[PDB]
Every structure is written in structure tokens, then in C-alpha cells.
Amino acid sequence: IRGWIFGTTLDSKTQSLLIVNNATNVVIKVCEFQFCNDPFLDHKNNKSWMESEFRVYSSANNCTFEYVSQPFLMDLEGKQGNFKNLREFVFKNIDGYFKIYSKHTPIIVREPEDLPQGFSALEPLVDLPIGINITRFQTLLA
Amino acid sequence: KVSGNYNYLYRLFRKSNLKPFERDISTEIYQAGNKPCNGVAGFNCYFPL
Structure with missing residues (x-):
């Protein structure tokens, strides 16, 4: 899983969000993006991942916000089994400011998805002056 | 300016x-009227700004 979208029309009628990450960078954009019905970064061949078809929007209009920064903890390629990563995010907008909180936990060893009876505080990631209206969201996964 | x-x-x-x-x-068209006003102007069809 890579990122999310946030908007109100999602079809180039109004501006919307784009949250994306790539290895050693993260891009946040607010723009009039024409979100195609198949935004993806996975279907490239049978069982391997390439990065093509990244630009799922054909309207590079006046993007009202661009931001490039440091990404989070990741791993290379993909291996099935012995999963241990527990990633946790929460997103909230208020007064025209978008806010993110994040936390990761290792060694989630149990195979059945019990989601064990654990607890942990969530720390703020960064504020953003989004200044736009949002009504719906959809996840962009590779 | 003059x-x-x-x-x-x-x-x-x-x-x-x-x-x-x-x-x-x-x-977008302000639909204060009760008709599917796309139009250009006129009765129940007004410019927004």
C-alpha cells in the first residue's frame, strides 16, 4: 500500500489531494487531478512489481500545492510470510488544516488476524495548510 | 484606473x-430555480460571479 486521495469530485471538476511515496522520497500534491477509474502501480506482469503507469491523472493543471520530503520505514521488493510490520495512521482535517498521526510496531507474529490486544500512543506527523474541502477518499496501492 | x-x-x-x-x-450554476439550468443566462439562469 502506498497512499490515499482526498477530494469532493475526483474527476478534474474540483481540486483534490494526492499522497504518494517512492523508496527515498514522499510527494504531497493538491491539484485538479483527473483520477482515472484504475489508478494503480501493481499490474505490470504476473508476480513482480514495476513503477510504470504512475501518472494516473491526465490533467496537470495549476497544482495549488506541491511538497517533497523524507519517507518512512520500508523494505525492498516483497516476500510472503513471516510478516511483522504493524503500520498505523490516522487522518483528520480541521479549520482548513490537514493532520496526520503515525506509528509502527514490529513482531506481529500470529498468523490469524487477531489484531492483538495492544496499546500505543500516536504522535503527530506534520500539519498542512490544505485549505480545501474534502468529502471522500480512496486508497492508491501498488 | 479611469x-x-x-x-x-x-x-x-x-x-x-x-x-x-x-x-x-x-x-457552477446556482440552481435556485426548479429547472435543470445549464443554459447561458435568463430566467432562473444567472451567472455565479
């Missing part, structure tokens, strides 16, 4: 009270 400066705009029609601290770029 000849007038025509690079300024302002909204007139909106059926929703916008929240504090946000923009709104949408220029």
Missing part, C-alpha cells in the same frame, strides 16, 4: 455557508 481595471472578481450566489479558512474555485 478606464477601469477588470481583473477583479467576487462571488454572489452560494446556497451553503462556507467554513472558516478555505478557498472555493468552483464556478
Whole structure:
């Protein structure tokens, strides 16, 4: 899983969000993006991942916000089994400011998805002056 | 300017009270009338800004 979208029309009628990450960078954009019905970064061949078809929007209009920064903890390629990563995010907008909180936990060893009876505080990631209206969201996964 | 400066705009029609601290770029037909007004102007068809 890579990122999310946030908007109100999602079809180039109004501006919307784009949250994306790539290895050693993260891009946040607010723009009039024409979100195609198949935004993806996975279907490239049978069982391997390439990065093509990244630009799922054909309207590079006046993007009202661009931001490039440091990404989070990741791993290379993909291996099935012995999963241990527990990633946790929460997103909230208020007064025209978008806010993110994040936390990761290792060694989630149990195979059945019990989601064990654990607890942990969530720390703020960064504020953003989004200044736009949002009504719906959809996840962009590779 | 005495000849007038025509690079300024302002909204007139909106059926929703916008929240504090946000923009709104949408220029859509205000359907205060009861007809599917796409139109250009006229009865129950007015420019937004």
C-alpha cells in the first residue's frame, strides 16, 4: 500500500489531494487531478512489481500545492510470510488544516488476524495548510 | 484606473455557508430555480460571479 486521495469530485471538476511515496522520497500534491477509474502501480506482469503507469491523472493543471520530503520505514521488493510490520495512521482535517498521526510496531507474529490486544500512543506527523474541502477518499496501492 | 481595471472578481450566489479558512474555485450554476439550468443566462439562469 502506498497512499490515499482526498477530494469532493475526483474527476478534474474540483481540486483534490494526492499522497504518494517512492523508496527515498514522499510527494504531497493538491491539484485538479483527473483520477482515472484504475489508478494503480501493481499490474505490470504476473508476480513482480514495476513503477510504470504512475501518472494516473491526465490533467496537470495549476497544482495549488506541491511538497517533497523524507519517507518512512520500508523494505525492498516483497516476500510472503513471516510478516511483522504493524503500520498505523490516522487522518483528520480541521479549520482548513490537514493532520496526520503515525506509528509502527514490529513482531506481529500470529498468523490469524487477531489484531492483538495492544496499546500505543500516536504522535503527530506534520500539519498542512490544505485549505480545501474534502468529502471522500480512496486508497492508491501498488 | 479611469478606464477601469477588470481583473477583479467576487462571488454572489452560494446556497451553503462556507467554513472558516478555505478557498472555493468552483464556478457552477446556482440552481435556485426548479429547472435543470445549464443554459447561458435568463430566467432562473444567472451567472455565479
